[PDB]
Design a protein around this ligand. Structure first.
Ligand SMILES: *Cc1c(COP(=O)(O)O)cnc(C)c1O
Ligand SMILES: *Cc1c(COP(=O)(O)O)cnc(C)c1O
Lengths: 422, 421
C-alpha cells in the first residue's frame, strides 16, 4: 500500500540476487555487504525475504540494544509523529526541553546538546573543547590540540578522517584538519607525555575501542587518564556511542572506572535504532561556550527523535538490560573460552565486556570469511571489523534461551570451520 | 501515555515561561529562540501549548515543504517502523536498493549515497571530489582545492566552519581544514580566475544562497559556471538541500538554468521533516571512488528513512507542488511589491523564486525584530537570517485560501511597523 512497497512490487524483485543487483546498480558502492536480504526484525531476530530466521549479532553495532521494532519505542514514534516532528530550535516546542532534562538528570550533566549522528556528536565536542580552550584556558588562537588514540573511530567527516589512523578512512581525503596528536590506546605513559603540552584542550577516547576491534584496556586505564587530564585542566571527552547504554553491563562503560566524563557522547542505541539522534553532555561552564549562532543543526533535537530517545532510554532501565548484558556476556565468554580455546588454534583471543564481544582470528591461518559464511549457515548474522575480528553484539533483549541457542550455533560454526581446515 | 508525555506531565509545565526556563536550564544554549512553544503542526499551520494558531513561514528552512505531519508520510513511517528500521549497510534489506533506484531515476543519476544530515551530504561530496581529483585527475597528494562562495552555508562540521566566511560559524573553532578558496557569490569572472589553479577538484555552490539571505544570482549564473567548470574538468557540486524539491517552483533550482549538477545534494524536505535523510548523487565514474570501507554511516540509508523519503518525494509529484510554488510565490512577490514598495521605505528588497522569498530591511532605519514580533502578533511565525533578512518559506501545501490570508497578514505587519515608525 505505501509508495516504497508499491514501487518495489513494480520492480519484481523475487530473489536475493534481484536485490543484490538492484543495490549494485543504484546504491553508492561504499559497503561490501553480507549476502542477505533482511525484510523484518523483531527483538534479537531478523528474517530474510525467503522467511529464513537469524539472530542479529551486529545489532547496528550496538544501535539496536532494545531489539528490532520494540513495541514501546515504535508506539512513542507513531504517537509523536502524528502530532509534531520538527520545529527547528529557532522555535520552542513542548518536547525538546523536557527530553534534555530527562537526559541531564539520567546522566548527571548541566547541559545537553542534541545532534543527529555519532559523527556530529564528536564534531560538536571538538568544537566545544577548542572554543573552551581558547576562551576559558586562554591558549593562543588556532593552537588547540586534541589527543586521540591509534585505531580510534568516531565517524566519517573530513575532521574524523583527519584524526584517524585507519588507511581506508583517510586515504585520498586530504588535506586534513590540523590539531590532533595520536598516541597508543591503553597506554597511560604516552598520555602523560602528551599532556605536557599546555596547548592540549582535550583527550578524546573510547572506554573500549569499537571499530578498532573491541579493544579492552587494562584495569584502571580510564581512571588514571582522567586524573592526568584534571591535573592539566584538560577535558576528558569519552565516546560512549558504542559502549554506552548498558551494552557493557553498566549504564556507561566509564562507570566501570567510576569516571564521570567531562564531555560525554551518546548515539546509536540512544534511539533504539529507530531514528538518528546523538547527544553531547557537559558542565555549564564548558557547554555554554556555544553561544547563539555559533552552532546548529536542522534536525538536532527535533521533537520526534526526542520522544523516541526518552522511550528508548526508559526501556534500558525497565528491562534491566545492564544486568542482562553483564550476566549473558560473562556466560558467552565463559562458553567460548571453554569449548574453543585449545581446540581451535587459529583463534587468537576471545574478549569483551557485557555483550560487546569479539573473537580475533589469525587471518594467515584461516580465511576469516569462512567463519562469517559458516555462522550465517548456522543462523547467525555478523560482520567483522578489520577483516579478522569477529564481532558478537546481539540486542540486549536476547532471551536466555535465544542466547543459549545462539551460543551453541556460534561454537558449532567455529568447530565446523576448524574441522573443515582438516 | 508514552514516556515523554508522562515525564513532561510530572514537570508541571503550564505556561510558555515554564518551558523557556526548562530550555535555559537543560538545553545547550546555542540557539536564541523566538518565544513560542509549538505543540502540534498540521500542513501550513502550527499551534502553541495554549491552542493559538500560526502559519509556519520557516517550515524548517524548507524541510517541511509537504507540511507538518503529512498523513501519507506519517502512515509510511508507521507502517515501515513496525517491520524494520535499521540493518546497517553491512547487511542487505528489501528497502534501500529500491529507494535509491527510485531516486536515481527521479533525478537522473547513476548512483545514490544516502546519509543523514545536510552537513554529512556536503562532507561526503567534498570527500568524493577530493578522492576523484586525486585518483582520476591525478592532482598531487594533499593539493586538492575546492572553490566556494562568500556567505555560503552547508553545515556546522569543523570542515564546514573551515570554509565559511560567517564570523560566528568559524570563530574559535580552529585550526581549520585547508584546501578552500572563497570567491564572491554571483560573480562569474571571479570563478573564472579561481579555475586557473589546476589543483581545483570542484566548485561547490547554492543555486540561491539560503542562510546567506536568499541571494538570487543574475540570469545565467549557474549555466555559465557549469561551462567554466567543464572546460577545466572541475566538478560542479550543487547544494539543493534548501532550494531543491520544488521550493523554487522547479524540481531542482538548477533546472531554472537547465544545469544537471555533476554532484547533487538533497536533504531537508527529502524526508518531509520527519527524520533526517540526505542524499549525494552523481555519475558512476565519480561516485564509485567511494570503495568499500572508505565511507559509511550507521544510520545512512536505513530502511525507515528510505520509506519516508520515497513517500515524501511522491507527495511532491502527486500534489504538483512545484506548480503550486511557482504560482503562489509569484502572487506573493507581486502583492508584496504592489502594496509595500513606495509605501514602506525601509524595505531594501523583496526577492526570491517560487516559495523561497525574502524581504531585506535596512537595519539602520528600523529594528529587524519589530517586524518579526508584529508578524508573530499577526499569526505569522518566521525567523530572519543575518538579522535584517526576513524569510517567507511556508510549506508548499499551503492552500489558496491559507496563502491569501497569510499574504494579507504579512502585508498588514510591514504596514503596521511603518505606521509605528
Ligand atoms: C558508530 C560510532 C560513531 C559514529 O556514529 P555515526 O552515527 O555512524 O556517525 C562514533 N563513535 C563510536 C565509538 C562509534 O562506534
Ligand atoms: C540547512 C542547510 C544545510 C545543512 O543541513 P543540516 O541537515 O542542517 O546539516 C546544508 N546546505 C544548505 C544549502 C542548507 O540550507
Amino acid at each position: 500500500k505505501t509508495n516504497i512497497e508499491a514501487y518495489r512490487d513494480g520492480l519484481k524483485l523475487k530473489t536475493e540476487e534481484d536485490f543484490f543487483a538492484c543495490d549494485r546498480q543504484y546504491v553508492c558502492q561504499n559497503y561490501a555487504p553480507v549476502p542477505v536480504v533482511i525484510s523484518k526484525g523483531k527483538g534479537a531476530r531478523v528474517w530474510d525475504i525467503n522467511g529464513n530466521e537469524y539472530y542479529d549479532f551486529l545489532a547496528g553495532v550496538s544501535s539496536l540494544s532494545q531489539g528490532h521494532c520494540h513495541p514501546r519505542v515504535i508506539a512513542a514514534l507513531c504517537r509523536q509523529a502524528e502530532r509534531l516532528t520538527l520545529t527547528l530550535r529557532a522555535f520552542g516546542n513542548d518536547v525538546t526541553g523536557p527530553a534534555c532534562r530527562f537526559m541531564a538528570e539520567m546522566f548527571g550533566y548541566d547541559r545537553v546538546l542534541l545532534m543527529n549522528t555519532g559523527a556530529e556528536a564528536g564534531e560538536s565536542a571538538l568544537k566545544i573543547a577548542r572554543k573552551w580552550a581558547y576562551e576559558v584556558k586562554e591558549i593562543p588562537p588556532d593552537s588547540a590540540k586534541v589527543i586521540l588514540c591509534n585505531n580510534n573511530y568516531w565517524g566519517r567527516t573530513i575532521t574524523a578522517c583527519s584524526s584517524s589512523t585507519t588507511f581506508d578512512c583517510y586515504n585520498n581525503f586530504g588535506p586534513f584538519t590540523p590539531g590532533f596528536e595520536l598516541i597508543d590506546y591503553d597506554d597511560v605513559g604516552a598520555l602523560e607525555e602528551a599532556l605536557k603540552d599546555p596547548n592540549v584542550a582535550a583527550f578524546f577516547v573510547e572506554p573500549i575501542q569499537g571499530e578498532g576491534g573491541v579493544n579492552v584496556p587494562k584495569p584502571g586505564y580510564l581512571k588514571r587518564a582522567h586524573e592526568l587530564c584534571r591535573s592539566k585542566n584538560v577535558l576528558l571527552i569519552v565516546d560512549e556511542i558504542q559502549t554506552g547504554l548498558c551494552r557493557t553491563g553498566r549504564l556507561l562503560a566509564a562507570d566501570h572506572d567510576e569516571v564521570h566524563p567531562d564531555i560525554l557522547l551518546l548515539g546509536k542505541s540512544l534511539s533504539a535504532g529507530v531514528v538518528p539522534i546523538s547527544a553531547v553532555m557537559g558542565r555549564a561552564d564548558v557547554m555554554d561556550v556555544l553561544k547563539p549562532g555559533t552552532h546548529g543543526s536542522t534536525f538536532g533535537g527535533n521533537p520526534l527523535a526526542c520522544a523516541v530517545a526518552v522511550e528508548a532510554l526508559t526501556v534500558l532501565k525497565d528491562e534491566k538490560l545492564a544486568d542482562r548484558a553483564e550476566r549473558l556476556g560473562a556466560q558467552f565468554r565463559d562458553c567460548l573460552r571453554r569449548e574453543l580455546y585449545g581446540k581451535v588454534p587459529w583463534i587468537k583471543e576471545i574478549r569483551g565486556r557485557g555483550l560487546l564481544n569479539a573473537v580475533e582470528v589469525d587471518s594467515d591461518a584461516i580465511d576469516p570469511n569462512d567463519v562469517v559464511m559458516k555462522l550465517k549457515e548456522n543462523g547467525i548474522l555478523s560482520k567483522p571489523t578489520r577483516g579478522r575480528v569477529m564481532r558478537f553484539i546481539p540486542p540486549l533483549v536476547i532471551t536466555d534461551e535465544e542466547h543459549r541457542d545462539a551460543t551453541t550455533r556460534i561454537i558449532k560454526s567455529f568447530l565446523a570451520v576448524e574441522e573443515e581446515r582438516k
